[PDB]
Design an enzyme around this catalytic site. Structure first.
Site, PDB file in Angstrom:
ATOM      1  N   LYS A 199      36.074  17.817  33.314  1.00  0.00           N
ATOM      2  CA  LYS A 199      36.193  18.486  34.600  1.00  0.00           C
ATOM      3  C   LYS A 199      35.371  19.724  34.756  1.00  0.00           C
ATOM      4  O   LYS A 199      35.073  20.083  35.896  1.00  0.00           O
ATOM      5  CB  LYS A 199      37.653  18.846  34.851  1.00  0.00           C
ATOM      6  CG  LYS A 199      38.474  17.651  35.309  1.00  0.00           C
ATOM      7  CD  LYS A 199      39.925  18.046  35.667  1.00  0.00           C
ATOM      8  CE  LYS A 199      40.010  18.802  36.958  1.00  0.00           C
ATOM      9  NZ  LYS A 199      41.395  19.347  37.090  1.00  0.00           N
ATOM     10  N   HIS A 200      34.992  20.374  33.645  1.00  0.00           N
ATOM     11  CA  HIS A 200      34.329  21.720  33.771  1.00  0.00           C
ATOM     12  C   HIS A 200      33.077  21.919  32.902  1.00  0.00           C
ATOM     13  O   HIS A 200      32.518  23.039  32.887  1.00  0.00           O
ATOM     14  CB  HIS A 200      35.323  22.813  33.512  1.00  0.00           C
ATOM     15  CG  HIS A 200      36.465  22.784  34.460  1.00  0.00           C
ATOM     16  ND1 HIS A 200      36.317  23.125  35.776  1.00  0.00           N
ATOM     17  CD2 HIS A 200      37.747  22.354  34.314  1.00  0.00           C
ATOM     18  CE1 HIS A 200      37.467  22.955  36.412  1.00  0.00           C
ATOM     19  NE2 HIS A 200      38.365  22.512  35.552  1.00  0.00           N
ATOM     20  N   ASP A 366      47.217  12.117  41.831  1.00  0.00           N
ATOM     21  CA  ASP A 366      47.037  12.754  43.112  1.00  0.00           C
ATOM     22  C   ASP A 366      46.510  11.741  44.130  1.00  0.00           C
ATOM     23  O   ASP A 366      47.229  10.773  44.362  1.00  0.00           O
ATOM     24  CB  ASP A 366      46.268  14.075  42.969  1.00  0.00           C
ATOM     25  CG  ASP A 366      47.114  15.114  42.294  1.00  0.00           C
ATOM     26  OD1 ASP A 366      48.227  15.488  42.772  1.00  0.00           O
ATOM     27  OD2 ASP A 366      46.763  15.553  41.220  1.00  0.00           O
ATOM     28  N   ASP A 373      45.577  24.081  46.429  1.00  0.00           N
ATOM     29  CA  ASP A 373      45.942  24.224  45.063  1.00  0.00           C
ATOM     30  C   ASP A 373      46.256  25.661  44.724  1.00  0.00           C
ATOM     31  O   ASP A 373      46.370  26.496  45.628  1.00  0.00           O
ATOM     32  CB  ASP A 373      44.830  23.591  44.111  1.00  0.00           C
ATOM     33  CG  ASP A 373      45.445  22.946  42.862  1.00  0.00           C
ATOM     34  OD1 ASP A 373      46.153  23.628  42.063  1.00  0.00           O
ATOM     35  OD2 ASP A 373      45.315  21.709  42.710  1.00  0.00           O
TER      36      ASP A 373
END
Ligand SMILES: CC(=O)N[C@@H]1[C@@H](O[C@@H]2O[C@H](CO)[C@H](O)[C@H](O)[C@H]2O)[C@H](O)[C@@H](CO)O[C@H]1O
Ligand SMILES: [Ca+2]
Ligand SMILES: [Ca+2]
EC number: 3.2.1.140
Length: 582
Positions: A199-200, A366, A373
């Site tokens: 994700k990062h 999700d 968020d």
């Protein structure tokens, strides 16, 4: 300054490269001089070109306010945008390192990037087609379907948790300074076959992130990093298309300096000076199309008042499913939402469309269009959502606070419209119109927390007068309702002492349900006015009980009312729902 010319078809690298009639052949020559690019210099790539197994890396330089560095195309536009296709080659690979813990994620490793901007300020990149393709990965969104067996539809994936991370464009700040005035404009980024999970890392179509220049190992490093901030300012990404990429579509702002921004969660409020100092300012995400991202479509991270407008997301979370996301390991992450903020202050999400977020039926935890968020003051207004596999809007957990969701339309969003899992307080949902089909309901089953619902139109688009569950749980006061319209229901919320009830949506709105079921083939937003207007079914008809029936709203988050979903002014008693009668 100096203009350079590159032609895959005509050029030669023995040439000078500084005139159109004698251009370079390859990007290696640009790479060799990119760190010395300066104000007014330009690198133009010939329309029709295909630079295979090539990449452009620009490090540690800048244009200036008077004259930026320009990376663009020349020649005949009908020949097709020039293509930079790194195919993951060794030479595109660089060692990313946040040099701090940035949560439970991979924060260090080898990344392939086709177009890298490392601490480059005042640069505009335009009119390029950019890929980062693996010939052994193929899973195009355009024909994607859920299969009972993996890869049975002539597709193939690499499901390895250790798959090398890949970016189309990466924007990297890691010198302890601001990286400013970067513009991406009319890029076509596709087939970036990155890691399915991470994700990062710089892993996706476009990712902008910030690292510490050194590890924070002493009191002295800590004094220094507290004042010398790697961060972004004036980043504009517009008119671009990102398609068929893993993992993220477009993400901007993740930062090692979350260790300061997130030192004290408190009550979820985010201090203005804090976010301006450590976060990213003047970020704008405008007129983009994101289709077929493996994970999330567009996310803004650690941004102070970004503006996210006129984007279309479509059919994302392609790989967030049990068949494709097989090695989640200790990181997890088998979750994705559409177009959303993480630990931002007062972001504005307006005039966006979001379609068909995938896979909530097949392991996406999700699946929403929208996700307020963790962060403070998210404003979602005048957005359309269709056909998302789990809800229009999430408000997520304790540190999601002070959201406003107004003048939006939700159509055929499944399994619930509003998802309120243990969210913080201050949330205000008003003047939306929501069209709830037999695959859906008002609240997701898991909802349990706060929101104030006013002036909404709720449409039960099913064949009986539904007894709806209006309330679930009581965290932070639960859901309170006032002055909403309830169309074709047998009941109403017990909190609403000012309910407007209507039997037949046909006597309320012109054509409920008739808004688009897909993005435009081009990826552009649908027209809202004129011959091609796509939302006219949501206009109140003559005599509609919506007209002049709304309360004068007092926004819990101090955003004044301006206009409706179609952009027409609201004056007087507002009409119920997202669209004023004209
Ligand atoms: C609070 C929470 O769990 N939010 C979920 C999101 O996950 C976070 O996303 C940020 C992105 O900067 C970090 O990755 C952080 O570690 C995560 O906890 C998740 O991305 C969204 C969309 O699926 O759902 C939220 O529930
Ligand atoms: Ca491929
Ligand atoms: Ca598949």
């Amino acid at each position: 300054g100096t203009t350079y010319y590159v032609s895959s078809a005509h050029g030669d690298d023995a040439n000078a490269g500084t005139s159109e009639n004698a251009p370079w052949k390859s990007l290696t020559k640009v790479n060799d001089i990119a760190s010395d690019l300066g104000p007014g210099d330009s690198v133009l790539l010939e329309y029709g070109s295909e630079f295979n197994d090539q990449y452009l890396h620009i490090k540690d330089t800048a244009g200036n306010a008077d004259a930026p560095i320009t990376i663009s195309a020349y020649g005949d536009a009908d020949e097709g945008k020039p293509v930079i296709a790194s195919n993951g080659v060794k030479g595109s690979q660089w060692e990313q390192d946040y040099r701090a813990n940035v949560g439970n994620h991979k924060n260090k490793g080898t990344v392939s990037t086709t177009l890298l901007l490392k601490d480059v300020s005042y640069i505009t990149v335009s009119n390029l087609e950019i890929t980062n393709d693996d010939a052994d990965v193929y899973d195009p969104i355009d024909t994607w379907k859920w299969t009972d067996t993996p890869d049975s539809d002539g597709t193939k994936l690499d499901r390895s948790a250790s798959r090398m991370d890949r970016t189309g464009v990466a924007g990297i700040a890691e010198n302890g300074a601001t990286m400013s005035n970067v513009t991406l404009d009319n890029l076509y980024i596709h087939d970036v076959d990155g890691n399915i999970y991470n994700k990062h890392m710089a892993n996706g179509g476009i990712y902008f992130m910030a690292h510490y220049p050194m590890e924070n190992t002493s009191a002295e490093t800590d004094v220094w990093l507290r004042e010398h901030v790697s961060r972004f300012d004036h980043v504009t990404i517009r008119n671009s298309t990102v398609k068929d990429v893993d993992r993220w579509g477009i993400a901007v702002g993740y930062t090692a300096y979350l260790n300061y921004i997130d030192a004290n969660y408190g009550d979820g409020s985010i201090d203005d000076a804090l976010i301006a100092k450590y976060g990213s300012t003047n970020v704008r995400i405008e007129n983009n199309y994101v289709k077929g991202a493996g994970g999330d479509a567009i996310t803004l991270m650690y941004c102070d008042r970004p503006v996210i407008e006129h984007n279309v997301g479509d059919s994302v979370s392609k790989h967030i499913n049990t068949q494709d996301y097989t090695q989640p390991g200790s990181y997890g992450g088998r979750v994705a939402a559409g177009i959303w903020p993480w630990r931002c202050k007062d972001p504005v999400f307006q005039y966006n469309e979001m379609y068909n977020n995938l896979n909530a039926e097949h392991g996406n935890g999700d699946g929403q269009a929208w996700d307020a968020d963790y962060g403070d003051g998210t404003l979602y207004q005048y957005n359309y959502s269709y056909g998302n596999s789990f809800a229009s809007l999430m408000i997520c957990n304790w540190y999601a606070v002070n959201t406003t969701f107004r003048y939006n339309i939700s159509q055929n969003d499944r399994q619930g419209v509003f998802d309120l899992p243990s969210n913080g307080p201050g949330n205000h949902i008003y003047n939306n119109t929501v069209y709830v089909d037999a695959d859906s309901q008002v609240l997701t089953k898991r909802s349990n927390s706060q929101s104030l619902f006013e002036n909404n139109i709720f449409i039960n688009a099913t064949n009986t007068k539904k007894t709806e569950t209006w309330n679930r749980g009581s965290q932070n006061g639960g859901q309170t309702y006032d002055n909403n319209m309830y169309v074709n229901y047998a009941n109403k919320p017990t909190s609403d002492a000012n309910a407007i009830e209507a039997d037949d949506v046909s006597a309320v709105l012109a054509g409920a349900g008739s808004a688009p079921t897909s993005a435009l083939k081009s990826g552009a937003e649908h027209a809202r006015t004129g011959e091609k207007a796509a939302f006219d079914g949501y206009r109140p008809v003559a005599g509609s009980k919506a007209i002049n029936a709304g309360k004068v709203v007092s926004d819990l988050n101090d955003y004044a009312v301006e206009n409706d979903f179609l952009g027409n002014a609201v004056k007087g008693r507002p009409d119920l729902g997202a669209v004023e009668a004209a």
